[PDB]
Structures are given as C-alpha cells and as structure tokens.
Design a protein around this ligand. Structure first.
Ligand SMILES: Nc1nc2c(ncn2[C@@H]2O[C@H](COP(=O)(O)O)[C@@H](O)[C@H]2O)c(=O)[nH]1
Ligand SMILES: [Cl-]
Ligand SMILES: [Mn+2]
Ligand SMILES: [Mn+2]
Ligand SMILES: [Mn+2]
Ligand SMILES: [Mn+2]
Ligand SMILES: [Mn+2]
Ligand SMILES: [Mn+2]
Ligand SMILES: [Mn+2]
Ligand SMILES: [Mn+2]
Length: 275
C-alpha cells in the first residue's frame, strides 16, 4: 500500500466531513468511544497491560499511577525541554515500578528538536549553551526514548515519532501534507503500537476553541490503510483525552493535563495479547 497526500490534507475539518459523507468513516457502529476500565480489573495471562499517559508538562508530583506492565508516554513531558525538566521527569520515571517505560517527545521538548535549536538566533531556552543540551535525550536513563524509531519489547513492535501539524513553530512542527507524510512513511508495516505526539484526523482531535478538527490526515490514512497497528496512542490535544476504536485499531488520547494544564485526567490502562 502506498499512501499519498490526501485531497483534503490541508483542511482537516473538511476532510472529516468529506469522509463521513462518502464512507461513514467516523461513524457507528464501527467507530465509537471505548469506556475506560478501572485499575483493579484483573489482567489476563499472556497479555501486557499498557499504562498510557501524555502531556504531563512537568506536573508529575501527585499523579496516581496504576498497576501495569509497560508505561507509554506520548510527549510534552516538559514545558520548554529545559535539561532540568528532563532530569525531573526521568527521576519520576525511575520510581515507577513498570518493567519498561517508553517515551517520545512532543512540541514542548524544544531542546530535542535540533533544527529548532540550530535556528535559534525564547528567553529561557535561548540562554542555553550547546553543551547544556547536547545530551538531553541521554538524560532519560529510566526510559526507552523513541524518535522516528522503534523497539521490540515482549514481542510487541512499538514505533514512536514526535511530529505534529504546524501550529506555532515549536518542537517537531511540520506543514501538513508531504512534509508529514515523509515522516509517517517511516512507520513500518507490522508495527503493533504506534506512538505519535498528536492525533490522526477524526480520532480525539477536536479543538473546541477553534471549532476545528486538527488531526493529521496523512497519519489517519497511514494508520488505517497501510500500517493497521492494534493501538495508536497520542496526546497533544488535551481536550481529546479518551479512547475510540475503528473496529480494528484502538486510539487512545492519553493527555494527562486538561486544556488548562491541570494534571487531572487519570492514566489509561489497556491490555493487549502478547505476540
Ligand atoms: N487550533 C489548534 N490548537 C492546538 C493545536 N495544537 C495544540 N493546540 C491547542 O493547544 C493545547 C496545548 O497544546 P500543547 O502546547 O501542550 O502542545 C491543546 O490542548 C490544544 O487546545 C493545533 O494544531 N490547532
Ligand atoms: Cl473525537
Ligand atoms: Mn458506555
Ligand atoms: Mn501538551
Ligand atoms: Mn520480562
Ligand atoms: Mn552536555
Ligand atoms: Mn500492519
Ligand atoms: Mn505486527
Ligand atoms: Mn503483530
Ligand atoms: Mn503538544
């Protein structure tokens, strides 16, 4: 399968309406919300319990973390990517019991976006000397950090990438269309769990303030038509916290912070059978 840039790529709200009219793409019975399960739900054998969080924004003190096996964090774990914020987050991760912790960056991780930093010439971030941030990802010693890259853990193929449709030119912002498709084309076919910082079109990507869908159309087409992972986890659009399915893939918007940056959305648990 070859994905090409969608006719409606630049206009996600119009894309949403288009595919609903022609294909019922975002409608029942196949597309619907999936209710969360409580933390005392027994995990069946030969399954892995994924604990999904995102957009913690350095507000980790006091998050109540559930029993599980593997933590997935889909980015915006800092406010500015300051090395001290990365260290604090890593310290928090080290105290969590999970066997594996998998992390991607989001748009707030400015210091991880080397093109953003190279172009810088942002009062707090501009003060940083090259030696201050040449090792930011190495500060994440208690995690497996993914960036257009993958890991196989317990047989699960997990791929992660930070890029989102351009909003304000912060970290890992790219124009809609081919620029983003070039990144999604890197996701391998047999990926089981896809982590992106932001949503695909139509799944937990509604922004009430603008009355617009903002998910990536190229990401949606990649997920549904080419890759077909069992789980696509992301955040970015804090308001979209919650879970949907399309009948095959489960989409989890794991945003821990609300749109007002309050870390009150509970971590989402999700069980998958081991490959
Ligand atoms: N309209 C619009 N709002 C966005 C976009 N990206 C992020 N936001 C808004 O900014 C909030 C915070 O995003 P963040 O700064 O943590 O990346 C989101 O919950 C959402 O309300 C976008 O592409 N378009
Ligand atoms: Cl939605
Ligand atoms: Mn219900
Ligand atoms: Mn965020
Ligand atoms: Mn083991
Ligand atoms: Mn250094
Ligand atoms: Mn596949
Ligand atoms: Mn597979
Ligand atoms: Mn598989
Ligand atoms: Mn974000």
């Amino acid at each position: 399968v070859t994905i090409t840039v969608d006719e409606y790529s630049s206009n996600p709200t119009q894309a949403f309406t288009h595919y609903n009219i022609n294909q019922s793409r975002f409608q029942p019975p196949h597309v619907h919300m999936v209710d969360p399960i409580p933390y005392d739900t027994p995990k069946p054998a030969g399954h892995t319990r994924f604990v999904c969080i995102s957009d913690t924004h350095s507000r980790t003190d006091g998050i109540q973390m559930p029993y599980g096996d593997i933590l997935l964090h889909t980015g915006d774990f800092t406010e500015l990517g300051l090395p001290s914020e990365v260290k604090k987050f890593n310290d928090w991760l080290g105290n969590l019991p999970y066997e594996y912790k998998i992390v991607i960056a989001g748009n707030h991780e400015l210091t991880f976006d080397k093109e953003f930093m190279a172009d810088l010439v942002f009062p707090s971030v501009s003060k940083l000397k090259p030696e201050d941030f040449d090792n930011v990802q190495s500060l994440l010693t208690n995690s497996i950090y993914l960036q257009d890259s993958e890991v196989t853990v317990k047989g699960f193929r997990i791929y992660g990438a930070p890029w989102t449709p351009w909003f304000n030119g912060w970290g890992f912002n790219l124009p809609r269309g081919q620029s983003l498709l070039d990144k999604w084309n890197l996701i391998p076919e047999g990926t089981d769990i896809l982590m992106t910082h932001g949503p695909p079109l139509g799944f937990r990507d509604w922004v009430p303030k603008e009355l617009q869908r903002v998910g990536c159309v190229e990401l949606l087409n990649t997920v549904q038509r080419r890759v077909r992972p069992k789980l696509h986890v992301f955040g970015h659009i804090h308001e979209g916290y919650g879970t949907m399915t399309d009948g095959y893939t489960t989409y989890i918007n794991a945003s821990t912070c609300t749109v007002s940056f309050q870390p009150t959305n509970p971590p989402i648990i999700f069980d998958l059978p081991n490959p």
